[PDB]
């Protein structure tokens, strides 16, 4: 038929394996290790759960997103300053992963910055779904857990801040992807040839076509029940750009009235 064990198909399985190994060393908290925490399938001393204001104030008497602090006594902004803090940390983790993509470092150095400039947001929201469920999201490298309703119980600008990510994560986690699917999918997002300001679009697309081939074979082998999952995963790349747009539109309110 179509799928066969040719030398070309093995090279796509070797690329998937290579990207998976760099996916483990670059990103400390993987999905499989995060799902075991959420479903209690592990024995990691049962991390803390922040579900209201009393659990937040009491839970902060243990090392948390207050790393460096005495900034922003208000809890609505202090939580938001923690998300942007680890987001910067996620930029360095994604960039270290991008270096392991075959051909990424061989591109123009300015294009490498451009691909990561407009790509980190979509990957931060993709990998955040691995830390989420219907109840909340793992925080502080799995040592905490902030509920979805407590985040929504914040003020008007900050209450709807995490909710679009939860609504994406519910439908995205329903696809039941593992780390082997996400590693290639993340590499496809980086090698996007439609980023603004790209100098050499052709060699970026030549790598993405190679990543798409590896992602196609991956989802066919790993997911026999979900036909057209490769098609569904590409449409999710359009869900992500709306989360980025809603996040930018949320930052407009901060400049307007937040003094």
């Amino acid at each position: 038929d179509k799928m066969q064990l040719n030398p070309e198909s093995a090279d796509l399985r070797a690329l998937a394996k290579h990207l998976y190994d760099s996916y483990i060393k670059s990103f400390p908290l993987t999905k499989a290790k995060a799902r075991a925490i959420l479903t209690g399938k592990t024995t990691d001393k049962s991390p803390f759960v922040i579900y209201d204001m009393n659990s937040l104030m009491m839970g902060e008497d243990k090392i948390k997103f207050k790393h460096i602090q005495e900034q922003s006594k208000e809890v609505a902004i202090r939580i938001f300053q923690g998300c942007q803090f680890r987001s910067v940390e996620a930029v360095q983790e994604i960039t270290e992963y991008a270096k392991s993509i075959p051909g990424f470092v061989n591109l123009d150095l300015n294009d490498q910055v451009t691909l990561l400039k407009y790509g980190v947001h979509e990957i931060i929201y993709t990998m955040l779904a691995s830390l989420m469920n219907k109840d909340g999201v793992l925080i502080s490298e799995g040592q905490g857990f902030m509920t979805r309703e407590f985040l929504k119980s914040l003020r008007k600008p900050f209450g709807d801040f995490m909710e679009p990510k939860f609504e994406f994560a519910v439908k995205f986690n329903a696809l039941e992807l593992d780390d082997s699917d996400l590693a290639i999918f993340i590499a496809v997002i980086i090698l996007s040839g439609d980023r603004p300001g790209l100098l050499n679009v052709k060699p970026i697309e030549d790598i993405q076509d190679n990543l798409l081939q590896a992602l196609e074979l991956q989802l066919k082998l790993n997911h026999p029940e979900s036909s057209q999952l490769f098609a569904k995963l590409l449409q999710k790349m359009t869900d992500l750009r709306q989360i980025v747009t809603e996040h930018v539109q949320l930052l407009q309110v901060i400049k307007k009235t937040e003094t």
Partner: peptide
Amino acid sequence: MGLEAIIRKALM
């Protein structure tokens, strides 16, 4: 440090 010096830094 506006998301461009951070990526430039990590890209040694």
